[PDB]
Swiss-Prot record, chains A, B:
One GO MF term: retinol binding
Gene designation per UniProt: LGB
Disulfide bridges in this chain: C66-C160, C106-C119, C106-C121
GO cellular component: extracellular region
Species lineage: Eukaryota, Metazoa, Chordata, Craniata, Vertebrata
The protein's name: Beta-lactoglobulin
Cell compartments where the protein resides: Secreted
Length: 162, 162
């Protein structure tokens, strides 16, 4: 319901390849509280499909091991919005990207936007990017976030951010 | 973490009574990551002693239960700085308080300050005090925090912030 930035004219062709989850924030602490939390997922690659859908390749900590996971995100009539059925979420919104440095996105469940919102700052390179983090924090300033995590370069490079 | 002009003239007797942990932040995500994390402690009461020490009464999730813990903070020559022997920390610093609404404090381990720093915003009622949170965030801007949690009234009223 709260209007945020959205990526007008998002071209997914241009988001393919490596990304690193630099920062994360969520409305409900439980979404991101513990390595085991349901929305603690680390984006490792984005893969647009021939049909214009988007595969999201993730790492996620489960039962003492770092697991590879893949979310299938279905295109919609809005370039920046995708439909999913994963992590108890049903939408992905791309807030902003410059393709070659950073990409900001949120996930939510349309049924319970207040209890399901989780957003990330992705960067292309495994460094703490000042521009990207500032843009992330600005983009979220009106959102009801109660947990925020920011990662260091060693964590960006390591499996499951260890 | 340093002794500021704000911290001068603290009267520890006046912090007696009931408090609630409204927000927490730490340098190392793993200090606060998960309910069971070592610095995930919820202050419920402060008990100053006649000789000027400070007992800190807390709730902490351990072995799948919400436990009560008491930490004795021993005075030093600086009124706002105390020695502790708990939580793999050895210092408590009171950054700021108005006695009747909010108190900001940090803990650290003087042998490894940067991987041990954890700070809290305490309030006198189980309500979200935006002004206290602003003071907290301003006080933390110079500190290398990587995790921040902010709690809601239901969490403040519950045991171990559930």
């Amino acid at each position: 319901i709260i209007v945020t930035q959205t990526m007008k004219g998002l071209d997914i062709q241009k988001v393919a390849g490596t990304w690193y989850s630099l920062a994360m924030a969520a409305s409900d602490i439980s979404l991101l509280d513990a390595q085991s939390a349901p929305l603690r997922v680390y984006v490792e690659e984005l893969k647009p499909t021939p049909e214009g859908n988007l595969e999201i390749l993730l790492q996620k900590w489960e039962n003492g091991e770092c697991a590879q996971k893949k979310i299938i995100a279905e295109k919609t009539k809005i370039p920046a919005v995708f439909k999913i059925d994963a992590l108890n979420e049903n939408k992905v919104l791309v807030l902003d990207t410059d393709y070659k440095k950073y990409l900001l996105f949120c996930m939510e469940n349309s049924a319970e936007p207040e209890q399901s919102l989780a957003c990330q700052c992705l960067v292309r390179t495994p460094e703490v990017d000042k521009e990207a983090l500032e843009k992330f924090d600005k983009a979220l300033k009106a959102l009801p976030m109660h947990i925020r995590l920011a990662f260091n370069p060693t964590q960006l490079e390591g499996q499951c951010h260890v």
